């Protein structure tokens, strides 16, 4: 009820204080975990963007379909026998 119960309490609260506000503590966990969360989320979009361009490059050499889309979308070239139509507003 005395210092046998008060000294055991002042150490627990210094332990609770060092748990929340402390090196590698709870607040350090929450802050770092939020960073790791947003990082891999952003890196996921970046890797998706790079893998898509890698596929375009992998098809521009040793492949024709990605080259043929550029041959039509950017140079308006059509294959022989294809009736070309055009839309105007």
């Amino acid at each position: 009820m005395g210092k046998l119960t008060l000294l055991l309490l002042a150490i627990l609260v210094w332990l609770q204080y060092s748990l929340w506000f402390g090196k590698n503590g709870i607040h350090d966990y929450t802050r770092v975990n939020d960073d790791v969360a947003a990082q891999q989320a952003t890196n996921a979009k970046l890797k998706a963007r790079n893998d898509q361009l890698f596929a375009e490059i992998d098809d521009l050499n040793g492949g024709q379909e990605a080259l043929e889309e550029r041959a039509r979308n950017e140079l308006s070239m059509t294959r022989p026998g294809e009736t070309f139509y055009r839309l105007v507003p």
Binding site: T5, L8, D28, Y29, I57, V88
Partner: protein, 81 residues
């Protein structure tokens, strides 16, 4: 009483648990900034490899080998919205 001595060891093993996962997360966050930097360098190099392959003088050279022909205005049907 000494029942708080139980609560001390409970919070002690809580601290070492948090300090381990945080130390494990900071090592992962440092790995992600290296991955982001490695992704951008790969992204920049890929764009430069696209300009070389997506060159119109190169595209027209291989598309004509694919038996294609430039857009001919007479053989062009027009439709109005």
């Amino acid at each position: 009483p000494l029942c708080l001595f139980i609560c001390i060891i409970l919070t002690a093993v809580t601290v070492v648990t948090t300090a381990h996962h945080t130390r494990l997360l900071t090592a992962q966050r440092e790995q992600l900034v290296l991955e982001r930097d490695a992704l951008d360098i790969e992204w920049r190099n890929l764009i430069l490899e696209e300009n070389a392959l997506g060159d119109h003088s190169r595209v027209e050279r291989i598309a004509t080998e694919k038996l294609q022909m430039q857009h001919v205005d007479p053989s062009q049907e027009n439709i109005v919205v």
